[PDB]
Structure formats: C-alpha cells, structure tokens
Design a protein around this ligand. Structure first.
Ligand SMILES: [Zn+2]
Ligand SMILES: [Zn+2]
Ligand SMILES: [Zn+2]
Ligand SMILES: [Zn+2]
Lengths: 228, 228
C-alpha cells in the first residue's frame, strides 16, 4: 500500500509490544513481515537481527530510525521516535514529538516547504538527544536541548513575520515543556532562556509584537553564551 | 526578658504542638504562661480563648498575629506567620517567609531603614494571602501574589542601584518559588511575569544591568495589566 499505512501498522505493532500484549519474538516476526510486504529489505534485515537475539528492541528502533532517515520516510520516523521516547521513561519528550508531528501534518497539507527542513533538523536534534539519553551522558543533553531551543527560536522568528497563529501556540507549549525538562535537570539559566523565548512568542501572539524583539535578541545572546 | 527570647519560646512551643509532642490544652497553657511572664496581656487573653475551646489553633494564630502587628513585635510576627503557613500544608510559603526573615535579620544589623517598611508591607501581603487561603478563595490569592511580585520588583529595582549581592539572590529565589506556586495554581501569564522579574534580577546580578531595565518595564507593565 502507501507509506502512510505502513507507519500506522508498525506503530500499532510497537504499541502492542509496549503495552505487554505481545512479546519480542512475536513483535520481530510481525514487524519483519510488515516490512517485507512493502518491499523495504534493509528494514527487514534490521528486524531479522532482532529475531536472532543479537540486538534489543531499543537498538533495533535506533537502527530502524537511521535507515528510515536514509530512505526518507517521515511518518515512520515520527512513529519510531515516539517509540524510542516511550521505551525510555520520558513522557515530556513524547509530548514534544507529538506536537512536532501535528505541526508537520499541518505543514504538508499546504505549500509551506521552508518549515520542512527546519522540522527535519529538529528531528535530527531530537534523535541525538535520545541517543545521548540512552548513553546516560547528561552533559550533551543540555547542549542539544539548547540547539533545539535555538531552532525553535528561528522558527518562531520566521512565523511571527507571517500570519500563523496555531504555530505560535504550539511553539509556546513546546518551549514550556523544554523549560520544565531543564528545571528537572538541575539547570536554571537554560530554563530561563527557554521561558524567555516562550514569553516572546506569547507576546507576539497577543498582539504586542513590538516588545517581542528585545526579548528575542536577549534570549538569543543568552543561549549563544550558555552553549560555549 | 527580651522580645527576641519570647519569640523563640513561643515558636518552640508551637513546633512542639505541630510535631505531635504536646496537645492543644498543654500548648494553650504553656503559651499563655509565656505571654503572661513577659507582660503581654492581650496575647494572654487571646490564648485564654483557645484554652476555653471557643476558637481553634489557626484562629488563635491569626488573632495573635494581628495583636503582634498592633504591638509591633517582628520576630513574633515571623514565628506566627511560619506557624500559620505550616498549619496549612504549604511548604513553599514557609520557605518564602524564611527567606524574608533572613532578609529582615540582615537589614536590622545595619542602618538600612527603608527596606524595613517594604518588608512590613510584604508581610501584610503574606498575611492577606494566608487569610485568603484559609477562606479557600483562590481568585484573590493570585491578585495578592501579583501585589507581592510587584513589591519584590520595587525592592530589586531599589537594590540594583546599590551594591548588594546576596539580596539579589534572595529576591531571585523568592520569585522562582512564586513562579512555581503560580504554575501549580493553573496560571501561566503571572508565572511568566514572575520569571521575567527573576531573569531581570539574575541579569543585573551577573553584570549586564543594561539589558535588565527593558525586562523591568516589560514585566511591570504585564503585571499591571494582569492585576486588573
Ligand atoms: Zn528475514
Ligand atoms: Zn532562576
Ligand atoms: Zn488567663
Ligand atoms: Zn507559557
């Protein structure tokens, strides 16, 4: 069928595994069969590696995400990222991925192609964040989250000069979630920068977009200073 | 003896009651004896009302605080406010009161007398906050907290033109606690204003006090709009 059906089928199989309905061998067989039905051979070999017990579910998910990035399947990428952030106990990152997925679905139904590359770059950043979390290395997580906040700053700057309003609310929600994540990570300066960007976005949405820019360059210099 | 030891004795009695070591009759008798020893008759009658069972511990604490406000005892005021905010399960307000007590204790050992009036006004605002919380009326709590944030903003504006450094850290911590309180109350705009003031204070303390003023009028304008 179409690439949208494959993503939904794979996602459903993964939720069945995660909820405890099926086990690892059943999941491997089902997902390998689904990939074989659609002609995706490399994904099939990656799942075969799980069927042999060489790798685990998390490593298989990471390799599947890399292969889908090489191939260019977007809905499968979102499904795999949600599964990765659900295997690791982080609901906030799953919420961020969900909001990004809704933004991508809104963007693809119109002619907006500039936001697509920015969403792809943020997907790369989220993938690196997940990889760093799997490595239990907390120092790179903060830097990657700072890069993600800068990318959201770029997108909100682009969107303010346009008439988009739902994008503003979604970016505000995402920035609030990252601020909570930073607070839970024992950091206060990066949380303050994220909340500054969120406040600027809210001010621009309200109607007072004259005061937003001062906050905007203030937050960007703070973010640039804190990365180094 | 001196009023400093009276507050310590009363506070120790109240913590003994709160920890479950002594009961209400024992606490009433002990506190009435302490007040009678130091010659405070009105406080003794207020405690006598508790001994007769007419009022409860929280009501007695409220009337004791009002009587101490009329008399002008500061350490007793702080003790009574901490007891009030401990009877109501709000550790964050107790932390705010503790930081205010440290601020007042630092101020009294030097010649700073202008901060005393503002600390007294903030104590009045905190007393109103406690009264509103006891009434379970959540709408006035947010407005009173907004007034408290405005007072803290005025104090940080006064302190920035001076050379104090620990003070700025103290308003920063207080404002962060108030922002957490606002977030837990299901509000986002007032929390954003409190975090804006805290960020301005942090920036001024760091050394870049030129960027803090824009934040200062932005936050104060937002607070003024949100109060009405
Ligand atoms: Zn096979
Ligand atoms: Zn802070
Ligand atoms: Zn008596
Ligand atoms: Zn917000």
């Amino acid at each position: 069928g179409t690439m949208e059906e494959l993503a939904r089928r794979v996602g459903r199989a993964i939720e069945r595994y995660l909820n405890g309905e099926i086990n690892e061998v059943e999941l491997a067989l089902a997902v390998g069969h689904i990939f074989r039905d659609y002609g995706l051979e490399e994904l099939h070999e990656i799942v075969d590696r799980l069927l042999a017990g060489e790798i685990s579910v998390l490593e298989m998910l990471f390799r599947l995400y890399e292969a889908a990035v090489k191939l260019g399947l977007d809905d499968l990428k979102f499904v795999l990222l949600k599964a990765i952030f659900k295997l690791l106990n982080e609901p906030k990152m799953v919420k961020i991925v969900e909001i990004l997925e809704e933004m991508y679905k809104r963007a693809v139904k119109k002619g907006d192609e500039e936001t697509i590359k920015l969403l792809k770059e943020m997907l790369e950043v989220l993938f690196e964040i997940a990889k760093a979390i799997a490595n239990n290395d907390k120092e790179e997580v903060k830097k990657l989250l700072a890069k993600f906040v800068l990318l959201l700053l770029e997108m909100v700057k682009r969107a303010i000069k346009k008439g988009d309003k739902e994008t503003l609310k979604l970016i505000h929600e995402i920035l609030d979630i990252i601020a909570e994540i930073f607070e839970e990570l024992g950091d206060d300066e990066l949380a303050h920068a994220a909340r500054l960007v969120s406040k600027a976005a809210e001010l621009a949405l309200k109607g007072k977009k004259e005061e937003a820019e001062k906050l905007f360059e203030i937050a960007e210099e703070e973010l640039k200073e804190l990365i180094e």
